[PDB]
């Protein structure tokens, strides 16, 4: 249901999260396109502790090398 | 599956995710369901009882 990258729950604005296995990508409803989790397709709001299911995962800033 | 069995092959989901992607349907986002989700199934099961 969401990804919790630092304490914080990450679900994605559109689409669903899916994982090959081992790394967790970000794809549309009707078609598979996996695509790396960012900021940007995922919005924060919540604690991590409420939601039920939660991974831990990784998210990639697309800022913070730049 | 959802919906999704309404179009082709049925798309096996998680229940919790069928209903965050519903309230996304209403513009009501998947955080409030997966904060809310023990009350929602309490609320649901009190109204099928
Ligand atoms: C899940 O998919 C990812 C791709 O995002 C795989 O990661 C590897 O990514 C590199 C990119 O530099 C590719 O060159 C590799 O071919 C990818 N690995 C594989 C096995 O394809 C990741 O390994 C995949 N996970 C599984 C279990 O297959
Ligand atoms: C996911 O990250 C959380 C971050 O809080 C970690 O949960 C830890 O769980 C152990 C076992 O109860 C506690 O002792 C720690 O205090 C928790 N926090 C940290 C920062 O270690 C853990 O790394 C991951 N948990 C799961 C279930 O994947």
Not at chain 1, 29 to 53: H, L, M
Not at chain 2, 2 to 21: D, K, N, S, V
């Amino acid at each position: 249901p969401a990804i919790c990258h630092d304490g914080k729950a990450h679900f994605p604005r559109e689409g669903v999260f899916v994982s090959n296995g081992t790394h967790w990508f970000v794809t549309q409803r009707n078609f598979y396109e996996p695509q790396i989790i960012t900021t940007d397709n995922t919005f924060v709001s919540g604690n991590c502790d409420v939601v039920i299911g939660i991974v831990n995962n990784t998210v990639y800033d697309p800022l913070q090398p730049e | 599956s959802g919906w999704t069995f309404g179009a082709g092959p049925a798309l096996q989901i998680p229940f919790p995710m069928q209903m965050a992607y519903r309230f996304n349907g209403i513009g009501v986002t998947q955080n409030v369901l997966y904060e809310n989700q023990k009350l929602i199934a309490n609320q649901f099961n009190s109204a099928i009882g």
